[PDB]
Amino acid sequence: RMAQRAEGLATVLAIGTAVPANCVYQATYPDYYFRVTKSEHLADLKEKFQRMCDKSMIRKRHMHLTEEILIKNPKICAHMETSLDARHAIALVEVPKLGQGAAEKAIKEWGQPLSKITHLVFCTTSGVDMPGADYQLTKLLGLSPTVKRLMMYQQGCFGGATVLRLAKDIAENNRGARVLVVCSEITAMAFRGPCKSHLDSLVGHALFGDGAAAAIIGADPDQLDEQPVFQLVSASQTILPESEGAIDGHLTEAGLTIHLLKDVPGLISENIEQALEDAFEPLGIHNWNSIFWIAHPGGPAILDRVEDRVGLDKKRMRASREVLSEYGNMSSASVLFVLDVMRKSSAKDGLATTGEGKDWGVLFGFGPGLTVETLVLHSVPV
Amino acid sequence: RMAQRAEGLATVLAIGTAVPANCVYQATYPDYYFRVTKSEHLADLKEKFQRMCDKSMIRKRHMHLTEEILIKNPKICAHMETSLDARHAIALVEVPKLGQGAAEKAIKEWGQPLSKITHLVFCTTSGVDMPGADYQLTKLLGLSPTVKRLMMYQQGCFGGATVLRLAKDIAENNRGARVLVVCSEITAMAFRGPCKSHLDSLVGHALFGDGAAAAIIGADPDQLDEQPVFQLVSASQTILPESEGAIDGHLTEAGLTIHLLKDVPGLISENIEQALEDAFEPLGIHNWNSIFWIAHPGGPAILDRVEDRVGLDKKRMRASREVLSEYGNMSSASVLFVLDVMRKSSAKDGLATTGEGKDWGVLFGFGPGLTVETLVLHSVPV
Ligand SMILES: CC(C)(COP(=O)(O)OP(=O)(O)OC[C@H]1O[C@@H](n2cnc3c(N)ncnc32)[C@H](O)[C@@H]1OP(=O)(O)O)[C@@H](O)C(=O)NCCC(=O)NCCS
Ligand SMILES: CC(C)(COP(=O)(O)OP(=O)(O)OC[C@H]1O[C@@H](n2cnc3c(N)ncnc32)[C@H](O)[C@@H]1OP(=O)(O)O)[C@@H](O)C(=O)NCCC(=O)NCCS
């Protein structure tokens, strides 16, 4: 036991990202969406969708699904037709392939041989299968057949926080472990035409985009060959009081359906200070403008309400809002994109640490429960 | 970091099991199965299914699905009709409820307050949903809202080994952590009528049953208040060479379909010696009759081929064969039932350890990949 284990904290050693090449601009999206679903006669519904997209603070999203694919799969354009098998035909191939794109970029930054990856954690909310995306990615990358795998399916938007919590315990308990974490999302599972009876589906179609992110996590980094980016200090999870049914998602004959209450930004903002105190009181930290912020960009209302309740300067949410602007809500992958934006912009602006010059940081994932996952991070010098 | 972590090995502190009350005897099952699926005109197929049931070495299985439920859900009785929503309506309720039955039993054996459970790992192969079964069980048991959860969906028959590997790293890396692990399986997702085009489906219908198992895992057991049952020494995982496509499962519009090659018992038995050497050579153990055996009872051919290739005395597989006889193949739950049978029959026969009087043991999970998971165990004195 005593020398089977690592000594130091789990550390992010590399981050990489990938998105589908196909880019949909938000400014023209209501026209596109109502045209390809043959729903232009639903004029009041289209005006509601236009207001949602104008308020989204999204400039563009990357989507694997193209009009050519929608023309070949018309049942996906209906609101609620039997379509799971046609959706799985796309997502069970594209989720591992997008993850491979991200993982290759992480592994290139890390610079170590594939044989040094001991563990793989793969997270998605886009389809399920056996063997899973973890097995498919093992095959695509040429990982060791002895790689220890964790397949995290149907996770939702806190999944990016969950894979870091998992990688922390693996990296710290196993000397020499190097964990590859990959989050990969393809919205072909959930895309459907609009309907007056499901206005919360319309909100999902204004926000959700595709993407994959990957990191290499290890404890006891090699002084010469590896370069720390962030340390993972602590990980917590809670179910919010009075939140039953706020965010539900069902995998059905008609694909993935989303059930989203208007109460979500309120429920999160009412409970976020208690999550901060629980994570930071043991470290003697109380000033929420003195830490860097990695907030899951679930939508602009969640970030606005948290900023207002906690009293943040507009700088604190900048990295989260840049990801929302350039990619939308990529479910489990989003927080790894925010970490990557933050460390790259910190170096580019000549700041002293990977966390915008701050030492301590917080990462928040939000999803069904309503669940809030809270990680404490430490930056490293630039 | 050095304050945050436990000292000793992750230990099983309690094990509990539960099955649906409804019991189907194997002797009469071909008549039942062909009658409730209205398939009596398929004479040749029924004779083939009779031979599979006679060779199964299964005396009975527990099944939530009853004839009354099958009468109300006729599309579940067809071979391949649209039926996922009807199957999910059963399994998304019954999986957490059967898990609750097992978890209550484990918690009673342990005797500590519910507030001492810090982590929950829930594994199933029977349906997916958001929030998941882990959330539903937290609600059913009244676990703390701060319980850190891992939801392991669409795992398959190595999932029982996987939750123990996860619990080992959590329990060892987190001082005071107590992990509730729960595996719960309901075959309503996969049950379907017979077809001459899918003989591997027929094999699934001869073998798979319903069941849930739970354990409490912790490191540094309290001298006065806790009593270890097994120690978790090491956990490995490998993909077998030349095994592509041996075991596939798809979640489709028609529910969960299984694709099973006749090659499976050969592939496992040809690679098991190497898995034993990898796990035990570092402990200086070479004699496979000197260790206790927890083998996933995937079917009688796997146990027979492993026993013959490795040269085991018939005593070694007794606990695995007893679980196969009394419950059939309960996917991810099966190995925890075997651990429970082994420790109970060891005490009843007055043996010196919970592992049939042996010090060291091996647990094997088998599933899609083809994946073999290998855990080294240590017994405790009786
Ligand atoms: C969608 C969003 C960008 C709109 O911005 P906003 O400042 O609230 O703008 P408004 O309040 O004017 O809302 C625009 C329209 O969206 C509708 N809307 C917003 N949230 C909705 C929901 N959950 N269900 C149904 N309609 C919703 C409003 O009713 C309004 O319809 P109307 O103009 O016909 O009355 C914003 O509400 C948001 O970020 N919410 C998402 C939070 C969330 O749940 N994200 C997590 C995803 S898991
Ligand atoms: C099915 C089983 C219980 C009985 O088979 P057995 O002891 O080999 O006896 P037999 O060879 O007479 O098998 C009976 C029939 O099963 C058929 N069968 C066995 N495995 C099969 C498979 N994977 N696909 C199709 N048919 C299969 C045989 O072809 C035979 O058909 P027949 O009687 O018309 O010739 C045994 O093969 C077994 O335990 N197999 C392991 C199944 C497995 O992979 N388990 C893990 C599932 S994850």
mmCIF file with all atom_site columns, C-alpha atoms in Angstrom, chain B residues 197-360:
data_model
loop_
_atom_site.group_PDB
_atom_site.id
_atom_site.type_symbol
_atom_site.label_atom_id
_atom_site.label_alt_id
_atom_site.label_comp_id
_atom_site.label_asym_id
_atom_site.label_entity_id
_atom_site.label_seq_id
_atom_site.pdbx_PDB_ins_code
_atom_site.Cartn_x
_atom_site.Cartn_y
_atom_site.Cartn_z
_atom_site.occupancy
_atom_site.B_iso_or_equiv
_atom_site.pdbx_formal_charge
_atom_site.auth_seq_id
_atom_site.auth_comp_id
_atom_site.auth_asym_id
_atom_site.auth_atom_id
_atom_site.pdbx_PDB_model_num
ATOM 1   C CA . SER B 1 197 ? -32.107 -15.209 -37.051 1.00 0.00 ? 197 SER B CA 1
ATOM 2   C CA . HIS B 1 198 ? -30.822 -14.397 -33.457 1.00 0.00 ? 198 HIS B CA 1
ATOM 3   C CA . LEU B 1 199 ? -29.718 -17.644 -31.714 1.00 0.00 ? 199 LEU B CA 1
ATOM 4   C CA . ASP B 1 200 ? -27.391 -15.621 -29.414 1.00 0.00 ? 200 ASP B CA 1
ATOM 5   C CA . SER B 1 201 ? -30.562 -13.842 -28.062 1.00 0.00 ? 201 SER B CA 1
ATOM 6   C CA . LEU B 1 202 ? -31.860 -17.371 -27.167 1.00 0.00 ? 202 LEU B CA 1
ATOM 7   C CA . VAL B 1 203 ? -28.672 -17.986 -25.114 1.00 0.00 ? 203 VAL B CA 1
ATOM 8   C CA . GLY B 1 204 ? -29.286 -14.672 -23.237 1.00 0.00 ? 204 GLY B CA 1
ATOM 9   C CA . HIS B 1 205 ? -32.835 -15.773 -22.430 1.00 0.00 ? 205 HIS B CA 1
ATOM 10  C CA . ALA B 1 206 ? -31.549 -19.096 -20.941 1.00 0.00 ? 206 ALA B CA 1
ATOM 11  C CA . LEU B 1 207 ? -28.975 -17.331 -18.675 1.00 0.00 ? 207 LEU B CA 1
ATOM 12  C CA . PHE B 1 208 ? -29.795 -13.723 -17.548 1.00 0.00 ? 208 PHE B CA 1
ATOM 13  C CA . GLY B 1 209 ? -31.712 -13.063 -14.318 1.00 0.00 ? 209 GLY B CA 1
ATOM 14  C CA . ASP B 1 210 ? -32.514 -10.054 -12.084 1.00 0.00 ? 210 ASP B CA 1
ATOM 15  C CA . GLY B 1 211 ? -30.757 -9.060  -8.862  1.00 0.00 ? 211 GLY B CA 1
ATOM 16  C CA . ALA B 1 212 ? -29.003 -6.334  -6.890  1.00 0.00 ? 212 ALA B CA 1
ATOM 17  C CA . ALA B 1 213 ? -26.038 -6.402  -4.572  1.00 0.00 ? 213 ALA B CA 1
ATOM 18  C CA . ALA B 1 214 ? -24.542 -3.715  -2.332  1.00 0.00 ? 214 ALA B CA 1
ATOM 19  C CA . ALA B 1 215 ? -21.367 -3.354  -0.263  1.00 0.00 ? 215 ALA B CA 1
ATOM 20  C CA . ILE B 1 216 ? -19.883 -0.806  2.114   1.00 0.00 ? 216 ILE B CA 1
ATOM 21  C CA . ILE B 1 217 ? -16.182 -0.128  1.368   1.00 0.00 ? 217 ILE B CA 1
ATOM 22  C CA . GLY B 1 218 ? -13.780 1.752   3.658   1.00 0.00 ? 218 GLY B CA 1
ATOM 23  C CA . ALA B 1 219 ? -10.114 1.978   4.548   1.00 0.00 ? 219 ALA B CA 1
ATOM 24  C CA . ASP B 1 220 ? -8.929  2.056   8.231   1.00 0.00 ? 220 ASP B CA 1
ATOM 25  C CA . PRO B 1 221 ? -11.937 0.174   9.722   1.00 0.00 ? 221 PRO B CA 1
ATOM 26  C CA . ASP B 1 222 ? -12.959 1.253   13.265  1.00 0.00 ? 222 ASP B CA 1
ATOM 27  C CA . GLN B 1 223 ? -11.531 -1.383  15.698  1.00 0.00 ? 223 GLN B CA 1
ATOM 28  C CA . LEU B 1 224 ? -14.703 -1.324  17.881  1.00 0.00 ? 224 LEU B CA 1
ATOM 29  C CA . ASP B 1 225 ? -17.534 -0.615  15.396  1.00 0.00 ? 225 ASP B CA 1
ATOM 30  C CA . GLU B 1 226 ? -16.620 -2.209  11.979  1.00 0.00 ? 226 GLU B CA 1
ATOM 31  C CA . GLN B 1 227 ? -15.608 -5.772  10.998  1.00 0.00 ? 227 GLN B CA 1
ATOM 32  C CA . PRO B 1 228 ? -13.842 -6.353  7.677   1.00 0.00 ? 228 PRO B CA 1
ATOM 33  C CA . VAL B 1 229 ? -14.972 -9.177  5.358   1.00 0.00 ? 229 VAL B CA 1
ATOM 34  C CA . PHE B 1 230 ? -12.419 -8.888  2.466   1.00 0.00 ? 230 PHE B CA 1
ATOM 35  C CA . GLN B 1 231 ? -9.534  -6.545  1.558   1.00 0.00 ? 231 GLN B CA 1
ATOM 36  C CA . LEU B 1 232 ? -9.171  -5.087  -1.960  1.00 0.00 ? 232 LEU B CA 1
ATOM 37  C CA . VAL B 1 233 ? -5.455  -5.514  -2.787  1.00 0.00 ? 233 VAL B CA 1
ATOM 38  C CA . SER B 1 234 ? -5.120  -4.644  -6.513  1.00 0.00 ? 234 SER B CA 1
ATOM 39  C CA . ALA B 1 235 ? -7.323  -4.124  -9.586  1.00 0.00 ? 235 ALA B CA 1
ATOM 40  C CA . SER B 1 236 ? -6.347  -4.666  -13.261 1.00 0.00 ? 236 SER B CA 1
ATOM 41  C CA . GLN B 1 237 ? -8.228  -4.605  -16.555 1.00 0.00 ? 237 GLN B CA 1
ATOM 42  C CA . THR B 1 238 ? -7.313  -5.896  -20.040 1.00 0.00 ? 238 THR B CA 1
ATOM 43  C CA . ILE B 1 239 ? -8.825  -6.214  -23.525 1.00 0.00 ? 239 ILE B CA 1
ATOM 44  C CA . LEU B 1 240 ? -8.326  -9.799  -24.834 1.00 0.00 ? 240 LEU B CA 1
ATOM 45  C CA . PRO B 1 241 ? -6.447  -10.187 -28.146 1.00 0.00 ? 241 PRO B CA 1
ATOM 46  C CA . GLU B 1 242 ? -8.544  -11.233 -31.198 1.00 0.00 ? 242 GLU B CA 1
ATOM 47  C CA . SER B 1 243 ? -11.838 -10.607 -29.274 1.00 0.00 ? 243 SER B CA 1
ATOM 48  C CA . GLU B 1 244 ? -13.361 -7.755  -31.360 1.00 0.00 ? 244 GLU B CA 1
ATOM 49  C CA . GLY B 1 245 ? -17.195 -8.161  -31.443 1.00 0.00 ? 245 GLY B CA 1
ATOM 50  C CA . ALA B 1 246 ? -17.260 -11.204 -29.069 1.00 0.00 ? 246 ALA B CA 1
ATOM 51  C CA . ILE B 1 247 ? -19.839 -9.484  -26.722 1.00 0.00 ? 247 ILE B CA 1
ATOM 52  C CA . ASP B 1 248 ? -21.803 -6.428  -27.991 1.00 0.00 ? 248 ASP B CA 1
ATOM 53  C CA . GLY B 1 249 ? -24.981 -4.845  -26.570 1.00 0.00 ? 249 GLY B CA 1
ATOM 54  C CA . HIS B 1 250 ? -26.989 -2.065  -28.243 1.00 0.00 ? 250 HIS B CA 1
ATOM 55  C CA . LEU B 1 251 ? -29.658 0.129   -26.639 1.00 0.00 ? 251 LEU B CA 1
ATOM 56  C CA . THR B 1 252 ? -32.164 0.453   -29.536 1.00 0.00 ? 252 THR B CA 1
ATOM 57  C CA . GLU B 1 253 ? -35.796 1.467   -30.244 1.00 0.00 ? 253 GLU B CA 1
ATOM 58  C CA . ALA B 1 254 ? -36.575 -2.237  -29.401 1.00 0.00 ? 254 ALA B CA 1
ATOM 59  C CA . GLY B 1 255 ? -34.659 -2.207  -26.063 1.00 0.00 ? 255 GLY B CA 1
ATOM 60  C CA . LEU B 1 256 ? -31.295 -3.819  -25.217 1.00 0.00 ? 256 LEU B CA 1
ATOM 61  C CA . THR B 1 257 ? -30.063 -6.382  -27.799 1.00 0.00 ? 257 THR B CA 1
ATOM 62  C CA . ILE B 1 258 ? -27.163 -8.785  -27.075 1.00 0.00 ? 258 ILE B CA 1
ATOM 63  C CA . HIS B 1 259 ? -24.670 -10.172 -29.684 1.00 0.00 ? 259 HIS B CA 1
ATOM 64  C CA . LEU B 1 260 ? -22.708 -13.175 -28.185 1.00 0.00 ? 260 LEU B CA 1
ATOM 65  C CA . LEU B 1 261 ? -20.113 -15.242 -30.200 1.00 0.00 ? 261 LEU B CA 1
ATOM 66  C CA . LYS B 1 262 ? -19.645 -19.021 -29.464 1.00 0.00 ? 262 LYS B CA 1
ATOM 67  C CA . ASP B 1 263 ? -15.891 -18.019 -29.066 1.00 0.00 ? 263 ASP B CA 1
ATOM 68  C CA . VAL B 1 264 ? -16.389 -16.401 -25.576 1.00 0.00 ? 264 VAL B CA 1
ATOM 69  C CA . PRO B 1 265 ? -15.533 -19.341 -23.255 1.00 0.00 ? 265 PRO B CA 1
ATOM 70  C CA . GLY B 1 266 ? -12.433 -20.135 -25.396 1.00 0.00 ? 266 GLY B CA 1
ATOM 71  C CA . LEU B 1 267 ? -11.232 -16.480 -25.458 1.00 0.00 ? 267 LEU B CA 1
ATOM 72  C CA . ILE B 1 268 ? -11.572 -16.128 -21.671 1.00 0.00 ? 268 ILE B CA 1
ATOM 73  C CA . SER B 1 269 ? -10.009 -19.509 -20.772 1.00 0.00 ? 269 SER B CA 1
ATOM 74  C CA . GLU B 1 270 ? -7.050  -18.913 -23.257 1.00 0.00 ? 270 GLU B CA 1
ATOM 75  C CA . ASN B 1 271 ? -6.117  -15.576 -21.510 1.00 0.00 ? 271 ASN B CA 1
ATOM 76  C CA . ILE B 1 272 ? -6.938  -16.290 -17.844 1.00 0.00 ? 272 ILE B CA 1
ATOM 77  C CA . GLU B 1 273 ? -3.493  -17.786 -16.979 1.00 0.00 ? 273 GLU B CA 1
ATOM 78  C CA . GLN B 1 274 ? -1.750  -14.581 -18.135 1.00 0.00 ? 274 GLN B CA 1
ATOM 79  C CA . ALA B 1 275 ? -4.195  -12.433 -16.041 1.00 0.00 ? 275 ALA B CA 1
ATOM 80  C CA . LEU B 1 276 ? -3.401  -14.625 -12.933 1.00 0.00 ? 276 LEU B CA 1
ATOM 81  C CA . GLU B 1 277 ? 0.412   -14.287 -13.542 1.00 0.00 ? 277 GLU B CA 1
ATOM 82  C CA . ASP B 1 278 ? 0.140   -10.456 -14.023 1.00 0.00 ? 278 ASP B CA 1
ATOM 83  C CA . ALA B 1 279 ? -1.846  -10.103 -10.723 1.00 0.00 ? 279 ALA B CA 1
ATOM 84  C CA . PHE B 1 280 ? -0.009  -12.689 -8.525  1.00 0.00 ? 280 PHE B CA 1
ATOM 85  C CA . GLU B 1 281 ? 3.650   -12.942 -9.723  1.00 0.00 ? 281 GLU B CA 1
ATOM 86  C CA . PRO B 1 282 ? 4.398   -9.683  -7.779  1.00 0.00 ? 282 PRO B CA 1
ATOM 87  C CA . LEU B 1 283 ? 3.117   -11.468 -4.546  1.00 0.00 ? 283 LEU B CA 1
ATOM 88  C CA . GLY B 1 284 ? 5.140   -14.666 -5.350  1.00 0.00 ? 284 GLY B CA 1
ATOM 89  C CA . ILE B 1 285 ? 1.923   -16.765 -5.770  1.00 0.00 ? 285 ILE B CA 1
ATOM 90  C CA . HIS B 1 286 ? 1.891   -19.411 -8.608  1.00 0.00 ? 286 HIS B CA 1
ATOM 91  C CA . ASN B 1 287 ? -0.490  -22.195 -7.423  1.00 0.00 ? 287 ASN B CA 1
ATOM 92  C CA . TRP B 1 288 ? -4.088  -21.343 -8.551  1.00 0.00 ? 288 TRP B CA 1
ATOM 93  C CA . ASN B 1 289 ? -5.511  -24.003 -6.139  1.00 0.00 ? 289 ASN B CA 1
ATOM 94  C CA . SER B 1 290 ? -4.008  -22.124 -3.164  1.00 0.00 ? 290 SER B CA 1
ATOM 95  C CA . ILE B 1 291 ? -6.259  -19.004 -3.685  1.00 0.00 ? 291 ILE B CA 1
ATOM 96  C CA . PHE B 1 292 ? -10.069 -18.565 -3.388  1.00 0.00 ? 292 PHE B CA 1
ATOM 97  C CA . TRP B 1 293 ? -11.993 -17.824 -6.616  1.00 0.00 ? 293 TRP B CA 1
ATOM 98  C CA . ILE B 1 294 ? -14.770 -15.273 -7.288  1.00 0.00 ? 294 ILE B CA 1
ATOM 99  C CA . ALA B 1 295 ? -15.492 -15.833 -11.030 1.00 0.00 ? 295 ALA B CA 1
ATOM 100 C CA . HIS B 1 296 ? -18.354 -13.959 -12.751 1.00 0.00 ? 296 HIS B CA 1
ATOM 101 C CA . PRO B 1 297 ? -20.834 -16.792 -13.524 1.00 0.00 ? 297 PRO B CA 1
ATOM 102 C CA . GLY B 1 298 ? -21.393 -15.718 -17.140 1.00 0.00 ? 298 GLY B CA 1
ATOM 103 C CA . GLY B 1 299 ? -22.488 -19.265 -17.976 1.00 0.00 ? 299 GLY B CA 1
ATOM 104 C CA . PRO B 1 300 ? -21.459 -22.865 -17.287 1.00 0.00 ? 300 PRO B CA 1
ATOM 105 C CA . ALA B 1 301 ? -19.109 -23.103 -20.327 1.00 0.00 ? 301 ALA B CA 1
ATOM 106 C CA . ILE B 1 302 ? -16.957 -20.159 -19.088 1.00 0.00 ? 302 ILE B CA 1
ATOM 107 C CA . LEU B 1 303 ? -16.562 -21.693 -15.581 1.00 0.00 ? 303 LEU B CA 1
ATOM 108 C CA . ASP B 1 304 ? -15.884 -25.225 -17.055 1.00 0.00 ? 304 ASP B CA 1
ATOM 109 C CA . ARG B 1 305 ? -13.289 -24.005 -19.631 1.00 0.00 ? 305 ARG B CA 1
ATOM 110 C CA . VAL B 1 306 ? -11.450 -21.823 -17.034 1.00 0.00 ? 306 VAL B CA 1
ATOM 111 C CA . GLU B 1 307 ? -11.412 -24.687 -14.450 1.00 0.00 ? 307 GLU B CA 1
ATOM 112 C CA . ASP B 1 308 ? -9.992  -27.135 -17.050 1.00 0.00 ? 308 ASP B CA 1
ATOM 113 C CA . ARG B 1 309 ? -7.391  -24.739 -18.606 1.00 0.00 ? 309 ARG B CA 1
ATOM 114 C CA . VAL B 1 310 ? -6.035  -23.577 -15.192 1.00 0.00 ? 310 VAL B CA 1
ATOM 115 C CA . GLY B 1 311 ? -6.348  -27.086 -13.615 1.00 0.00 ? 311 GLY B CA 1
ATOM 116 C CA . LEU B 1 312 ? -8.581  -26.105 -10.692 1.00 0.00 ? 312 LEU B CA 1
ATOM 117 C CA . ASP B 1 313 ? -9.936  -28.620 -8.233  1.00 0.00 ? 313 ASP B CA 1
ATOM 118 C CA . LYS B 1 314 ? -13.817 -28.616 -8.482  1.00 0.00 ? 314 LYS B CA 1
ATOM 119 C CA . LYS B 1 315 ? -13.951 -27.013 -4.946  1.00 0.00 ? 315 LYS B CA 1
ATOM 120 C CA . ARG B 1 316 ? -12.587 -23.683 -6.353  1.00 0.00 ? 316 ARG B CA 1
ATOM 121 C CA . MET B 1 317 ? -15.663 -22.795 -8.509  1.00 0.00 ? 317 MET B CA 1
ATOM 122 C CA . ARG B 1 318 ? -18.293 -24.036 -5.972  1.00 0.00 ? 318 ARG B CA 1
ATOM 123 C CA . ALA B 1 319 ? -19.412 -20.489 -4.809  1.00 0.00 ? 319 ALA B CA 1
ATOM 124 C CA . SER B 1 320 ? -19.578 -19.193 -8.454  1.00 0.00 ? 320 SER B CA 1
ATOM 125 C CA . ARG B 1 321 ? -21.621 -22.285 -9.519  1.00 0.00 ? 321 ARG B CA 1
ATOM 126 C CA . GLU B 1 322 ? -23.963 -21.905 -6.528  1.00 0.00 ? 322 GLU B CA 1
ATOM 127 C CA . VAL B 1 323 ? -24.797 -18.290 -7.631  1.00 0.00 ? 323 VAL B CA 1
ATOM 128 C CA . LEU B 1 324 ? -25.307 -19.529 -11.259 1.00 0.00 ? 324 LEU B CA 1
ATOM 129 C CA . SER B 1 325 ? -27.587 -22.360 -9.961  1.00 0.00 ? 325 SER B CA 1
ATOM 130 C CA . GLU B 1 326 ? -29.711 -20.189 -7.617  1.00 0.00 ? 326 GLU B CA 1
ATOM 131 C CA . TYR B 1 327 ? -29.893 -16.837 -9.576  1.00 0.00 ? 327 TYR B CA 1
ATOM 132 C CA . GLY B 1 328 ? -28.499 -17.311 -13.108 1.00 0.00 ? 328 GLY B CA 1
ATOM 133 C CA . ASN B 1 329 ? -26.306 -14.555 -14.633 1.00 0.00 ? 329 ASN B CA 1
ATOM 134 C CA . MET B 1 330 ? -27.250 -11.213 -12.926 1.00 0.00 ? 330 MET B CA 1
ATOM 135 C CA . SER B 1 331 ? -24.717 -9.188  -14.968 1.00 0.00 ? 331 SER B CA 1
ATOM 136 C CA . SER B 1 332 ? -22.849 -6.616  -12.834 1.00 0.00 ? 332 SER B CA 1
ATOM 137 C CA . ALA B 1 333 ? -24.380 -7.805  -9.494  1.00 0.00 ? 333 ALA B CA 1
ATOM 138 C CA . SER B 1 334 ? -23.187 -11.456 -9.804  1.00 0.00 ? 334 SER B CA 1
ATOM 139 C CA . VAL B 1 335 ? -19.661 -11.228 -8.306  1.00 0.00 ? 335 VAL B CA 1
ATOM 140 C CA . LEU B 1 336 ? -20.957 -9.547  -5.098  1.00 0.00 ? 336 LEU B CA 1
ATOM 141 C CA . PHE B 1 337 ? -23.437 -12.426 -4.629  1.00 0.00 ? 337 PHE B CA 1
ATOM 142 C CA . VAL B 1 338 ? -20.497 -14.859 -5.079  1.00 0.00 ? 338 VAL B CA 1
ATOM 143 C CA . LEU B 1 339 ? -18.463 -12.943 -2.415  1.00 0.00 ? 339 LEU B CA 1
ATOM 144 C CA . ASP B 1 340 ? -21.481 -13.124 -0.071  1.00 0.00 ? 340 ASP B CA 1
ATOM 145 C CA . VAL B 1 341 ? -21.991 -16.906 -0.712  1.00 0.00 ? 341 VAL B CA 1
ATOM 146 C CA . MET B 1 342 ? -18.262 -17.538 -0.212  1.00 0.00 ? 342 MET B CA 1
ATOM 147 C CA . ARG B 1 343 ? -18.001 -15.730 3.181   1.00 0.00 ? 343 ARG B CA 1
ATOM 148 C CA . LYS B 1 344 ? -21.300 -17.260 4.482   1.00 0.00 ? 344 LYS B CA 1
ATOM 149 C CA . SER B 1 345 ? -20.447 -20.872 3.464   1.00 0.00 ? 345 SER B CA 1
ATOM 150 C CA . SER B 1 346 ? -16.842 -20.451 4.864   1.00 0.00 ? 346 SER B CA 1
ATOM 151 C CA . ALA B 1 347 ? -18.325 -19.534 8.332   1.00 0.00 ? 347 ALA B CA 1
ATOM 152 C CA . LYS B 1 348 ? -21.004 -22.308 8.122   1.00 0.00 ? 348 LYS B CA 1
ATOM 153 C CA . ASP B 1 349 ? -18.285 -24.991 7.290   1.00 0.00 ? 349 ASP B CA 1
ATOM 154 C CA . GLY B 1 350 ? -16.004 -23.735 10.187  1.00 0.00 ? 350 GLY B CA 1
ATOM 155 C CA . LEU B 1 351 ? -13.144 -22.678 7.841   1.00 0.00 ? 351 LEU B CA 1
ATOM 156 C CA . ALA B 1 352 ? -10.393 -20.360 9.216   1.00 0.00 ? 352 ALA B CA 1
ATOM 157 C CA . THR B 1 353 ? -10.981 -17.385 6.790   1.00 0.00 ? 353 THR B CA 1
ATOM 158 C CA . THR B 1 354 ? -13.837 -15.716 4.857   1.00 0.00 ? 354 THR B CA 1
ATOM 159 C CA . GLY B 1 355 ? -12.064 -17.052 1.695   1.00 0.00 ? 355 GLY B CA 1
ATOM 160 C CA . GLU B 1 356 ? -12.598 -20.868 2.241   1.00 0.00 ? 356 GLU B CA 1
ATOM 161 C CA . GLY B 1 357 ? -9.594  -20.888 4.636   1.00 0.00 ? 357 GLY B CA 1
ATOM 162 C CA . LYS B 1 358 ? -7.266  -19.359 1.995   1.00 0.00 ? 358 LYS B CA 1
ATOM 163 C CA . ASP B 1 359 ? -5.462  -16.042 2.519   1.00 0.00 ? 359 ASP B CA 1
ATOM 164 C CA . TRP B 1 360 ? -5.393  -14.702 -1.083  1.00 0.00 ? 360 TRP B CA 1
#
